[PDB]
């Protein structure tokens, strides 16, 4: 049951310095490389280095090379990709990877995503979106949830506390000036709505912000 | 994890007079040990092991010429102008295309050009380093007690018998205890910081393989190469060529693979697998077996009471004894296995030893098998199994008398002296005076001389030897056997040690 | 090059099956027999200066065959 | 040092169909040491095959990586809606380590047109000073659409916002979100606003406005 | 013109189909079906049995080791026909000339 | 197992060493000369002389 | 093979550039003279040789440096 | 390889005025071997300077060369009116032969905005199905200037086509076209085109437009 658990995904800001753990577990720690992986957040598998785990001498990739610490702790396992003065690049799903070396990296961190920039914690700007005489499709009136302007993510946004998943498209949080927006679109029958209540329910824990913001017809 | 069958299986003399041992050991060698109170016991390394491998450097052996840019200036303008030496991936050669009035130029028979084509390697191949502190050792040990032919061949049994063991030493950790269980435990002492020089080569990968090749060496290799990781080569332009200038044209030409050459250029080379590791096969390793919890169950048990059987039929080894296995009928189990060596059936008297020690029934079930061996004398012998006629014996040969034997002993000597160096001197193990010495002796002798002239191959030194030969029979007295000394031996015997 | 100039030999360790095995202990004599081979008219001119020079008999000997080594790898 | 690319970069597939997701070594011969990884989005990427010839523990025989030193291939002569994932192969000849561009497993279907709904910005957002058009385009299949924002007739690029769901994963459409967001003075000083969508589905832009002017 | 080729070389073959075909000490050479077809090509060999391993003696064996050959990539010569030779001259007189 | 070595294609380069670069694609263009023809100026004149 | 016994040297009319030429003249001399190089422990060693013996001064040297070039590659 | 740069672009200037022209030698030390080349538009050029250090015989002592081989300046102490032109600097230490990115001599005067004037396409144009809005801004100092085309609101950069006068030859100001060409169509299917010019003498855009709506 070879595991490599990293530290856990965490926000940061430009100028700072963030040094991810990755334990290793189920073998033998020193007879094997230690391999970093960068995931950025919309591109592949981009290699960071390794480290020695016997010797604890770290190699990185040209791109990788001087802003990053490989370093690990023998007894407990625990490699660590450690990047200096953070950089929104700096954000992505970060991996250590057990060598089997030539023959590649076996197992993988369960994988740490860096979010590195500078705002502040923001609650979303949740509109319930009503449909107009366009947005009537068939039975169904497409209904919606505007959040606008949070950070960080996520939000989290049902539909009468989740009761309507079924004609629910909750679109993906995308940024706006470092905060966020996801668009939720439920697609209810107009039979019901607006005759029963139709409310998107945005839960934004990071800011502590549940948003219940229903549907009526403009 | 047994010597069971194995090709190079050498007992080991107990001297007694200590429960520990230095001992020298190899991957493919299992080391069979015996003494007193000590049980016969298997020790053999696994393989070596190096987990963690990183690339000294890599190399181009096959490239392809392109982008062919030859830029032609006119006679007399000197030195020619491609701007591709702005570009590493190009590969630019001056130069000059002879002139008539007629092509491109108002002058005759000189010229200028700058020639450029891009660089591209079509194939390249890789050295490797090894850390020791990333070497391994994986020596199975075991210990011969109530055995059969599967158990004996098979580890996860005798995991369980407790007569087996399997381990890693590293310079870190250089020594490891184990118990044997009901023999008691044993310890091995080892210096895997002496064991191999990990620095002594590299781990050159030459196709999907990967080999050992001397670091010097390595680099001595000609060919275009490149930084460990990337990109910016040494004399790429050695896989590619050139061609006349007829006006302008002229075509850089990359040779083709030169794999085949690199297989070539290994002949001293090894064999070694990557797996998540390079594991080794050839070993050398200085270990200290101490047996000082190393004991003996079965002294009170009684000699077994029952017909016995051949589980399999007498046979030797190879390695000079005989190996048979007892089913035994009797159900008076756990008993003593009475079996003797004798030389005549007339007479009672044990010649030959037990290899394996204090031959045991385990238990009481009746036909348990037990895989049991002693050694014969040379001459005819009787493997003898039993008291009275419910006893059986067996006939055995073993022609390998003693003067013969002696020179398997002597001889085998120095060719366990040559070519392993000055650890040949741990055969001399429990040593000092003379043993202790004679490492001396080639200790520092060693580490020069035939170094010295060492890295010639087979008969080259051999030859300097047989060059070296009438400068016994032509010189002065008391000076004839001093630069007679170095001819034969340690030089024609690593010679004549491959003869072929 | 490619050729020439192998690891060969390791001599480290290895009781053991080397990669390229058998080549190594043939290279020499053959290919300096096949080329001298190839060419007979060289071989018999090497034995001449053996004798013509040193004039001591035993060591005259050491000339020739010597050389006709040195013109295989010159 | 050493290059890949890994095509498709993805493939709508039956499940239980056989596709063969190439892969190949730009430098040298990679020989061995190329592995296939899949990627379920999310998750650190799942090794698939080692040497790329030869399956993981874990992994099952359906996936079949071969090719050889310039060229590999991650075959899964049985995809599936398990085998859904983003697919990697990695020269490990020479540090350094790399990936090719990957490959999705997208299970096939049948081509469905987004049902797109396009909001004005409510009440809560016309009192806020801001306003987006907001306009959810729903359960298209393919994922391969079109978006555009046309205000008065003239079309606007500006305050546009897209959000979509991946393959939907009951009915494996698409859905998307496009939102034109505004500011409430040049929302009201202009009137029409449309979200057109040209999807595969369709050979026109599928159209759905409101005129501020209009209810 | 047309040049004859006296035969072909392989320079890169394969190792293809590895057979190998076992048998006990002393029971002797192994054969193979693969040395029927000279596509396959055989090595015998041994390889010591304890009785771990398959066989009632100790420290012999038998196997037939075999590939398949295959020529991946292979070279060639070519004899030039002595009445194909041609020489193509281009012969010139000096009259008024230009550059071009 | 068997094992086969490496493309010797570059090491027949490297078999090359005084080779002639030759074009045979239905037919061989071969470079360096060597014939012996016997001009005849009979018939040869000089043109101009008036 | 293809590691030696190349075509080189054609040398039937053929008057024009080979296709290797200048790698060939380096052939001998170096390698012999890397691995000499390599084992200056050997040239310590190796031209003690011919002075030892016959007392003939130019010619004792005729053994050693020649001998010298023997060595590598045989 | 040797690089010039001379600056300024261009100077605007009193005639007798001293304005220097700069110039500096990238690479080396150009030493002498640099120039000055008056080319006034569409002539070919004409040397003024030599060796940097040195006037040709036709170009008068007004023009002097100075600056010693990383850098140098092209001086006229009285710049005129017949010294209203292109000048280039030339390193001619090496080949290659290179130019600096020239100064041009501008007179000075005072700032003068643009007389703009937005014509519709003629109805000889429209006749055509082809429609070209006009707007001619004209005798402007200096020629610092932009044009915006504004449609039912909506400026639109498209089918925009600017032609200008250069220095004026009476004024000395600039005067400019602005062409918004359109298809009748979208020419017919908006309304207000709307060319507004920000000029230095202008803190705003001047704005001229026509609704087609209006006559």
């Known amino acids: 049951q070879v595991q490599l658990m990293e530290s856990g995904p965490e926000l940061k800001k430009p100028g700072e310095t963030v040094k991810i753990s990755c334990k290793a577990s189920?073998?033998?720690?020193?007879?094997?490389?230690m391999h970093w992986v960068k995931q950025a957040p919309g591109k592949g598998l981009k290699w960071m280095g390794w480290?020695?785990?016997?010797?604890?001498?770290?190699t990185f990739a040209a791109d990788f090379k001087g802003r990053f610490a490989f370093s690990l702790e023998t007894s407990a396992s625990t490699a660590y990709l450690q990047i200096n003065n953070l950089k929104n690049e700096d954000t992505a799903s970060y991996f250590c990877?057990?060598?089997?070396?030539?023959?590649?990296?076996?197992?993988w961190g369960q994988g740490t995503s860096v979010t590195v920039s500078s705002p502040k914690t923001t609650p979303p700007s949740v509109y319930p979106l009503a449909p107009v005489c366009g947005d009537t499709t068939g039975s169904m009136v497409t209904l919606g949830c505007l959040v606008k302007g949070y950070f960080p993510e996520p939000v989290t946004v049902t539909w009468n506390s989740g009761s309507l998943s079924s004609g629910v498209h909750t679109f993906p949080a995308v940024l706006q000036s470092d905060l966020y927006t996801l668009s939720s679109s439920v697609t209810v029958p107009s039979s019901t709505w607006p005759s029963e209540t139709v409310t998107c329910n945005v839960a934004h824990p990071a800011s502590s912000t549940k948003v219940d913001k229903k549907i009526v017809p403009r | 994890f047994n010597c069971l069958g194995m090709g190079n299986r050498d007992f080991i003399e107990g001297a007694s007079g200590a429960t520990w041992v230095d001992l020298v050991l190899e991957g493919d060698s299992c080391l069979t040990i015996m003494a007193n109170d000590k049980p016969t016991l298997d020790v053999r390394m696994i393989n070596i092991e190096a987990s963690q491998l990183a690339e000294v450097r890599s190399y181009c052996y096959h490239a392809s010429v392109t982008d062919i840019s030859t830029v032609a200036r006119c006679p007399m303008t000197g030195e020619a102008h491609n701007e591709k030496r702005a570009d590493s991936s190009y590969v630019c050669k001056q130069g000059f295309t002879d002139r008539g009035w007629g092509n491109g130029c108002g002058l005759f028979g000189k010229g200028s050009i700058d020639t450029c084509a891009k660089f591209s390697c079509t194939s390249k191949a890789i050295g490797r380093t090894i850390q020791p502190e990333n070497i391994k050792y994986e020596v199975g040990i075991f210990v011969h007690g109530t055995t059969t032919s599967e158990n004996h061949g098979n580890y996860s049994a005798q995991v369980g018998a407790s007569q087996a063991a399997k381990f890693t030493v590293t310079p870190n950790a250089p020594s490891i205890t184990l118990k044997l269980g009901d023999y008691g435990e044993v310890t091995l002492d080892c210096e895997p910081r002496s064991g191999l020089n990990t620095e002594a080569f590299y781990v050159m990968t030459v196709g999907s393989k990967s080999f050992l090749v001397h670091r010097e060496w390595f680099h001595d290799l000609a060919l275009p190469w490149t930084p460990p990781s990337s990109t910016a080569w040494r004399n790429r332009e050695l896989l590619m060529e050139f061609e006349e200038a007829h006006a302008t044209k002229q075509s850089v030409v990359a040779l083709g693979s030169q794999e085949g050459g690199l297989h070539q250029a290994l002949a001293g080379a090894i064999v070694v697998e990557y797996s998540s590791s390079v594991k080794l096969t050839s070993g050398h390793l200085k270990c200290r077996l101490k047996m000082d919890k190393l004991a003996l169950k079965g002294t009170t048990y009684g000699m077994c009471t029952g017909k016995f059987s051949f589980a399999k039929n007498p046979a030797d080894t190879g390695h000079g004894t005989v190996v048979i296995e007892l089913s035994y009928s009797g159900s008076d189990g756990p008993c003593k296995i009475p079996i003797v060596s004798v030389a005549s059936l007339n007479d009672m008297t044990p010649v030959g030893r037990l290899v394996t020690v204090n031959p045991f029934v385990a238990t009481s079930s009746a036909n348990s098998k037990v895989l049991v061996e002693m050694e014969p004398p040379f001459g005819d012998s009787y493997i003898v199994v039993g008291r009275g006629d419910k006893q059986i014996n067996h006939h055995w040969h073993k022609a390998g008398s003693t003067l013969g034997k002696a020179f398997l002993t002597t001889l085998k000597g120095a060719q366990r002296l040559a070519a392993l160096g000055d650890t040949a001197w741990d055969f001399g193990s429990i040593g000092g005076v003379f043993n202790s010495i004679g490492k001396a002796v080639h200790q520092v002798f060693g580490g020069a001389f035939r170094t010295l002239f060492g890295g010639m191959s087979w008969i080259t030194q051999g030859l300097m030897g047989a060059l070296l030969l009438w400068m016994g029979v032509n010189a002065r007295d008391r000076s004839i056997a001093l630069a007679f000394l170095a001819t034969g031996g340690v030089l024609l015997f690593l010679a004549t040690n491959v003869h072929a | 090059s490619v050729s020439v100039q192998t690891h060969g030999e390791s001599s480290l360790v290895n009781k053991t099956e080397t990669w390229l095995d058998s080549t190594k202990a043939t290279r020499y004599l053959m290919k300096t027999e096949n080329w001298i081979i190839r060419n007979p008219g060289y071989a018999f001119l090497a034995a001449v200066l053996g004798w013509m020079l040193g004039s001591n008999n035993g060591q005259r000997v050491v000339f020739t065959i010597l050389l006709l080594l040195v013109a295989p790898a010159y | 040092d050493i290059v890949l690319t890994q095509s498709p970069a993805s493939l709508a597939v039956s499940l239980g169909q056989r596709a063969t997701i190439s892969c190949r070594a730009s430098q040298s011969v990679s020989t061995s040491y190329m592995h296939w990884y899949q990627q379920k989005p999310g998750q650190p990427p799942r090794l698939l095959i080692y040497l790329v010839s030869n399956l993981e523990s874990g992994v099952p025989s359906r996936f079949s990586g071969s090719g050889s030193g310039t060229d590999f291939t991650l075959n899964i002569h049985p995809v599936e809606a398990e085998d859904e994932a983003t697919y990697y192969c990695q020269h490990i000849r020479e540090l350094t380590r790399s990936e090719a561009g990957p490959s999705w497993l997208e299970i096939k279907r049948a081509d469905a047109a987004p049902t797109v709904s396009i909001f004005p910005p409510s009440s809560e957002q016309l009192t806020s000073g801001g306003a987006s058009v907001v306009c959810f385009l729903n359960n298209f299949y393919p994922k391969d659409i079109n978006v555009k924002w046309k205000i008065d007739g003239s079309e606007r690029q500006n305050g546009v916002l897209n959000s979509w769901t991946d393959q939907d994963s009951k009915d494996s459409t698409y859905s998307m979100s496009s939102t034109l967001t505004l500011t409430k003075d040049e929302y009201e000083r202009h009137n029409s606003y449309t979200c057109e969508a040209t999807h595969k589905t369709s050979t026109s832009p599928i159209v759905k406005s409101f005129n501020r002017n209009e209810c | 013109s047309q040049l004859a080729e006296v035969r072909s070389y392989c320079y890169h073959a394969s190792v293809t189909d590895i057979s190998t075909v076992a048998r006990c000490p002393m029971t002797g050479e192994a054969h193979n079906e693969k040395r029927a077809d000279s596509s396959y090509v055989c090595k015998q060999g041994f390889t010591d049995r304890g009785w771990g391993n398959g066989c009632g003696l100790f420290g012999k064996g038998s196997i037939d080791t075999c590939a398949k050959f295959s020529c991946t990539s292979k070279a060639i010569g070519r004899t030039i026909q002595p009445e194909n030779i041609k020489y193509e001259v281009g012969i010139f007189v000096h009259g008024t000339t230009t550059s071009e | 197992s068997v094992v086969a070595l490496g493309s010797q294609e570059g090491g027949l380069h490297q078999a090359l060493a005084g080779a002639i670069v030759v074009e045979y694609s239905s037919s061989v263009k071969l470079t360096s000369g060597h014939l012996k023809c016997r001009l005849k100026m009979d018939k040869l004149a000089l043109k101009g002389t008036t | 093979s293809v590691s030696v016994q190349t075509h080189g040297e054609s040398s039937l009319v053929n008057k024009t550039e080979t296709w290797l030429d200048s790698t060939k003249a380096t052939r001998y001399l170096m390698k012999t003279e890397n691995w000499i190089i390599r084992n200056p422990g050997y040239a310590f060693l190796a031209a003690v040789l011919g002075w030892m013996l016959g007392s003939n001064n130019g010619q004792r040297v005729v053994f050693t440096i020649l001998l010298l070039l023997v060595a590598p590659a045989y | 390889d040797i690089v010039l740069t001379q600056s300024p672009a261009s100077l605007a200037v009193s005639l007798g005025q001293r304005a220097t022209i700069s110039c500096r030698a990238s690479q080396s030390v150009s030493t002498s071997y640099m120039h000055w080349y008056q080319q006034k538009p569409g002539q070919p050029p004409r040397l003024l300077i030599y060796l940097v250090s040195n006037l040709e015989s036709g170009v008068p002592s007004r023009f002097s060369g100075s600056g010693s081989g990383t850098d140098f300046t092209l001086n006229i102490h009285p710049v005129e009116a017949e010294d209203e032109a292109t000048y280039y600097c030339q390193h001619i230490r090496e080949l290659t032969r290179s130019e600096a990115g020239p100064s041009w001599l501008e007179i000075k005067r005072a700032d003068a905005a643009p007389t703009v004037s937005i014509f519709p396409p003629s109805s000889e144009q429209l006749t055509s199905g082809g429609a070209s809005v006009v707007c001619f801004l004209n005798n402007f100092y200096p020629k610092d200037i932009n044009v915006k085309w504004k449609i039912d609101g909506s400026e639109r950069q498209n089918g925009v086509l600017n032609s200008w006068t250069d220095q004026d030859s009476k004024d000395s100001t600039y005067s400019m076209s602005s062409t918004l060409t359109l298809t009748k169509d979208e020419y017919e299917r908006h309304n207000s085109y709307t060319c507004e010019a920000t000029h230095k003498t202008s803190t705003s855009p001047i704005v001229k437009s026509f609704n087609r709506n209006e006559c």
């Open positions: 990877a057990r060598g089997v070396g030539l023959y590649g990296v076996d197992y």
């Open positions: 480290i020695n785990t016997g010797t604890g001498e770290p």
């Open positions: 189920g073998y033998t720690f020193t007879d094997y490389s």
